[PDB]
Amino acid sequence: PDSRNIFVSHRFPERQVDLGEVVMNFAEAGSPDNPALLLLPEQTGSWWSYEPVMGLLAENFHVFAVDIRGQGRSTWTPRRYSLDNFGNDLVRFIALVIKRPVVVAGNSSGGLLAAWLSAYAMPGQIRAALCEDAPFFASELVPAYGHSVLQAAGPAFELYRDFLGDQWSIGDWKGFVEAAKASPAKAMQLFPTPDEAPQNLKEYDPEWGRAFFEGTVALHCPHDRMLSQVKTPILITHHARTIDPETGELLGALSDLQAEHAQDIIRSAGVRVDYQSHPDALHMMHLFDPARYAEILTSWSATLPA
Amino acid sequence: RNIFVSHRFPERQVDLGEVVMNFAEAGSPDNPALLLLPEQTGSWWSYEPVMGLLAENFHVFAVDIRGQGRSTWTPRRYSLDNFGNDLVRFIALVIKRPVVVAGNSSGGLLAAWLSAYAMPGQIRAALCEDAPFFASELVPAYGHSVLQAAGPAFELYRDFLGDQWSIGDWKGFVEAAKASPAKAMQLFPTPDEAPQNLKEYDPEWGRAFFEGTVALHCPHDRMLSQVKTPILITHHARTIDPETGELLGALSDLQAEHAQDIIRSAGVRVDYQSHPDALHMMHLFDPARYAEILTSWSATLPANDHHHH
Ligand SMILES: C[C@H]1CCCC(=O)CCC/C=C/c2cc(O)cc(O)c2C(=O)N1
Ligand SMILES: C[C@H]1CCCC(=O)CCC/C=C/c2cc(O)cc(O)c2C(=O)N1
């Protein structure tokens, strides 16, 4: 994987654009007369996390699915992984490639960035943001509310750092898998441990995981302040989540309490916010139940002002 | 936040999205565009005495960086990357042409930031006026850290003025400054009343430098390795105290030598001028000299003719 020559074929053509520091890879679907839709993957996911759902969304949207920096065919940038750098790359992407206002939809950390764009993009760039099971608060080191990253997804990111290493400099996949299987963190059960590293992980810069676990990725983007600054309608979907009865760990993206405060803050900013709890859905609904995801996204987007 | 004073160039503001950025414009768009970045604690009008000279030959934009002047104060969001992307947006939304960027001190850091990290084609060239490469980092690759240079002053901005002037203990700041063991404290204003520039300054800037958060995600050795335009480095007064080892000045000879080396190994044009008797803010305290440095160097840039009309 530190070859950066490990890529495979996909169903939609891919194109790259120079944003200045990062060269961003992306795939396009749908017809350009339809409203623009920017799709942001989960951490460890390339644009083609959205490949099964892109055909469905192609019926109604002009779809751009991107590799975020440090993922896929987009530039890996050591020591530069922050929500602000991720977000400003996407501001540049809209300005250089799309050149229209977008609906932005993001899963997990991509949902953090969907909110980031609502608050901090260039004026007019963002019509609305869909935050698909975004770990508001629970992906911070010291959140204003609820479980920290250390008490939720952190243990997996720690193992990415310790065994895969920055830019796959260590690459001990077998040691990662044996450490993951031996971990006493119940949340580890939500992460794949196949016999060989899966394609999405070979495209992933594990310094992402370091930055989340060490609390550097969002040091300059406290979530309570970010959510208070959003400027567009927001849709929050909230998928599976439980509190482990033996460790107290959060299993899922964010707890009910965290979701309640996220809504409250957005509402206090005076922007439209809608919340949908889908407690039996998997974290990556856009991948594992694309028809349900597409319906949610399409139906909501139809309620947006023109 | 209503302590502003008049100035001899009209000021305007532009919404960048998060930051509303204040700036002063002078000159004709027929001449090359020039973006002026102040030092930390300096508003755009740090350049007000020299802009008349520069407006003879340049279309000048002098800006208030986020957390300074009339530009939005943004609690907890002070980083070189956020400062830098604001300026990327400013060029894209206001200037709409390639620019020469000239910055003093932290503004010089940001000029190099733009050279490396702006959108393609935005930056023609960067003038880094006594920029504290390495010396303004918490863990620099080379030489003094901020803790052995300007840090003690920023520490006192944090401790006595506070984030967004939330403490505001100017008297106690002055008293602590005078009592400081740091020889470098003599380089900072300690008047009996807070000066105008500092009333316009968000001291969380100082916190961010002292605590090593402002450039956590922008190590300077890597930044300098990624520059993509010609760079002019001016290096003004500096000495290293023989008793404490403190750096008095923006950067040491060792730090300037590595900065040059790194830029040159990026394969771009780099020029270095040592002005060991110049004050840190030469653009303010020796404006005629500074204007001649910038103008004469700009005239040697490729496409200087294309940018005249
Ligand atoms: C890798 C991606 C895969 C999801 C693995 C899980 O289903 C665990 C529960 C959901 C939380 C994930 C999660 C937390 C976080 O604090 C930061 C992140 O980027 C994610 C994030 O993107 N996970
Ligand atoms: C306040 C402004 C003016 C104070 C200048 C001095 O006379 C001290 C000399 C060294 C440079 C300061 C300096 C260091 C740094 O690590 C980061 C910075 O932004 C400055 C910076 O902009 N100083």
Author numbering:
A (entry chain B): 21 to 326
B (entry chain A): 24 to 332
Q: What do the study's own words say?
A:
Zearalenone (ZEN) is a mycoestrogenic polyketide produced by Fusarium graminearum and other phytopathogenic members of the genus Fusarium. ZenA cleaves zearalenone [ZEN, (S,E)-14,16-dihydroxy-3-methyl-3,4,5,6,9,10-hexahydro-1H-benzo[c]oxacyclotetradecine-1,7(8H)-dione] to hydrolyzed zearalenone [HZEN, (S,E)-2,4-dihydroxy-6-(10-hydroxy-6-oxoundec-1-en-1-yl)benzoic acid], which decarboxylates spontaneously to decarboxylated hydrolyzed zearalenone [DHZEN, (S,E)-1-(3,5-dihydroxyphenyl)-10-hydroxyundec-1-en-6-one]. Furthermore, we report site-directed mutagenesis as well as structural analysis of the dimeric ZenARe of R. erythropolis and the more thermostable, tetrameric ZenAScfl of Streptomyces coelicoflavus with and without bound ligands. The X-ray crystal structures not only revealed canonical features of α/β hydrolases with a cap domain including a Ser-His-Asp catalytic triad but also unusual features including an uncommon oxyanion hole motif and a peripheral, short antiparallel β-sheet involved in tetramer interactions.
As inactivation of ZenAScfl by substituting the catalytic His-286 with tyrosine (H286Y) caused conformational changes at the active site, we attempted to get structural information with a bound, noncleavable substrate analogue. A derivative of ZEN, which is a cyclic amide rather than a cyclic carboxylic ester, was synthesized. In line with proposed nomenclature guidelines, we called the molecule zearalactamenone (ZLAEN). The ligand was found at the active site of ZenARe, and the resorcylic acid moiety was in the same position as the one of HZEN in ZenAScfl H286Y. Most of the structure of ZenARe remained unchanged upon binding of ZLAEN. However, the positions of the amino acids Met-208 – Pro-214 at the lip of the cap were shifted upon binding. The biggest movements were observed for Leu-210, where Cα was shifted by 4.4 Å and CD by 6.7 Å, and Phe-211, where the Cα was shifted by 3.1 Å, and side-chain atoms were shifted by up to 5.8 Å. The nucleophilic Ser-112 appeared in the same orientation as in the unbound structure, forming a hydrogen bond with N21 of ZLAEN at a distance of 3.5 Å. The side-chain amide of Gln-63 formed a hydrogen bond of 2.8 Å with the hydroxyl group connected to C-16 of ZLAEN. However, crystal structure analysis revealed that only ZenARe underwent a structural change resembling enzyme closure, with residues in the cap’s lip adopting a more closed conformation of the ZEN-binding pocket.
